[PDB]
């Protein structure tokens, strides 16, 4: 709301507190080169906010806990540069530090809840658009009621959703004086090395190489069970992605002959042999791209779209990851504000919530930052614990009513 004025009071580097962990100072000359799966992502920041109720730890305890957590996550204390002996793009573990921003809002948090995705959400996390050198930027905003908002702005080249989520939990763990779990794995040069000889088994070229308003659409358990009915011979996520893909295509009013594709993130950790440990700090993500004609997607039953997604997601297996790694290492540029005729669905259904505790209990709210990018959908839990889903849909003003009608 126009009355929630955020005053940013201070900003400071937080470096790793080796002493608080009882660990040997690391060398500020340590370098971790980016893997080919890291460089499959774009040089850009992703932002999220968490809200906590008044019994909130002081800024000093949160900051000490960040310094402690950054011993096991030096990547987020580091800078992007080039390794001297390689000429390769790398994370320099120079321990320069993550940005910690302290701020106040001159309103009770309750007075602006439920918080909807507007540009005013951007005020509750550090910017990822003003060329920050820090790879992790954290803001704590204390409201007049003693509630806090914790905002994250994180560089995608460093970590995927899972790895970034691990850091969030690691910071909560360290703040309470605990060891971090999972135990992190940082030795990236050990991972995603080409095969001898190199085997490319798929086509990686063409794949990896009015105003937009964001509206929150709530999808109930009842509505989900009905969708699952119209798709019967399964997966909540696969059904919902298929529904949202149909409804965006219908809402856009595309000519039926236009080819439309949904990008779906696939975690390769459990798909590859040997498995990548859940503690791996880096990206292990490639994208399934089920494609259809707009006509084939809207006129054919929901079942057809679900099946396209199922078959394309199952194609992105250990072997696909291995094909990508060998090719990305061979002798182009990655394909990573309007996706039409395509969409992307970023699923955050595994986001830490119930267990993110800094000492004052779990959060009562979470939201993606305002991302006014047409067709970039973010799927989120509703926080009710019932399995209901919240979809944040950016569409042009003219299309949003048409999208909501189709959705319901």
Which among 406, 21, 24 is positioned nearest to 223, based on CA atoms? 406
Query: What CA–CA distance (Å, rounded) separates 406 from 201?
Result: 39
Q: How far from chain centre, in Å, is Cα 175?
A: 23
- Let me know the angle formed at the C-alpha of 113 by 111 and 114, rounded to the nearest 5 degrees: 155
Catalytic residue check, 234: no
Exposed / middle / buried, residue 293 (Cβ in 10 Å: 0-12, 13-18, 19+): middle
* Residue 289 CB partners (closer than 8 Å, separation 6+): 207, 261, 262, 263, 264, 312
> CA separation (Å) from 162 to 208, 246, 330, 331?
20, 28, 28, 30
The residue from 30, 267, 346, 357 that is catalytic is 357
The residue from 72, 125, 156, 326 that is catalytic is 156
Please say whether the beta carbons of 66 and 152 come within 8 A: no
Residue whose structure tokens are 């949003």: 400
CA dihedral 332, 325, 184, 74 (to 10 degrees): -20
Catalytic residue check, 156: yes
Query: What CA–CA distance (Å, rounded) separates 210 from 79?
Result: 38
What does the buried/exposed string (b/e) look like for 250-283 if buried means 16 or more CB atoms within 10 Å of the residue's CB? bbbebeeeeebbbbbbbbbbebbeeebebbbbbb
CA atoms within 13 A on the CB side of 310: 11
Residues catalogued as catalytic: 156, 357
């Amino acid at each position: 709301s126009e009355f929630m004025k955020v005053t940013v009071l201070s900003s400071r580097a937080v470096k790793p507190d080796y002493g608080a962990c009882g660990a040997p100072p690391g060398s500020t000359a340590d370098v971790v080169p980016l893997t080919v799966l890291d460089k499959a992502n774009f040089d850009a920041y992703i932002s999220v906010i968490y809200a906590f109720r008044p019994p909130a730890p002081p800024n000093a305890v949160l900051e000490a806990g960040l310094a402690r957590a950054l011993v096991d996550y030096r990547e987020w204390a580091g800078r992007l540069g080039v390794d001297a002996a390689s000429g390769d793009r790398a994370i320099l573990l120079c321990d320069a530090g993550a940005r910690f921003v302290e701020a106040t809002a001159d309103v009770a948090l309750d007075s602006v809840m439920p918080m909807k995705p507007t540009p005013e959400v951007l005020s509750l996390h550090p910017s990822g658009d003003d060329g920050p050198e820090e790879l992790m930027l954290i803001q704590v905003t204390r409201f007049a009621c003693g509630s806090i908002v914790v905002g994250f702005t994180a560089q995608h080249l460093v970590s995927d959703g899972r790895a970034t989520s691990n850091f969030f939990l690691a910071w909560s763990q360290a703040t309470r004086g605990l060891a971090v779990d999972p135990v992190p794995v940082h030795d990236r040069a050990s991972f995603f090395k080409p095969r001898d000889p190199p085997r490319v088994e798929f086509e990686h070229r063409g794949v990896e190489f009015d105003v937009v308003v964001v509206n929150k659409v709530h999808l109930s358990l009842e509505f989900i069970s009905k969708l699952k009915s119209r798709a019967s011979v399964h997966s909540t996520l696969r059904c919902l992605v298929a529904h949202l893909w149909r409804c965006v295509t219908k809402a856009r009013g595309l000519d039926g002959r236009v080819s439309t594709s949904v990008a779906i993130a696939v975690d390769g950790r459990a798909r590859m042999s040997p498995q990548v440990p859940d503690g791996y700090t880096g990206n292990v993500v490639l994208w399934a791209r089920p494609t259809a004609t707009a006509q084939e997607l809207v006129t054919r039953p929901l079942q057809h779209a679900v099946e396209l997604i199922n078959r394309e997601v199952a194609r992105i297996n250990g072997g696909y990851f291995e094909s990508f790694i060998d090719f990305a290492s061979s002798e182009l540029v990655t394909t990573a504000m309007a996706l039409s005729p395509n969409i992307e669905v970023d699923s955050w259904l595994r986001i830490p919530f119930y267990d993110l505790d800094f000492g004052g209990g779990q959060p009562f709210f979470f939201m993606p930052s305002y991302l006014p990018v047409e067709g970039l959908l973010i799927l989120l839990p509703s926080f009710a614990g019932d399995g209901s889903v919240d979809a944040y849909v950016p569409l042009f003003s003219r299309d949003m009513d048409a999208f909501k009608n189709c959705c319901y």
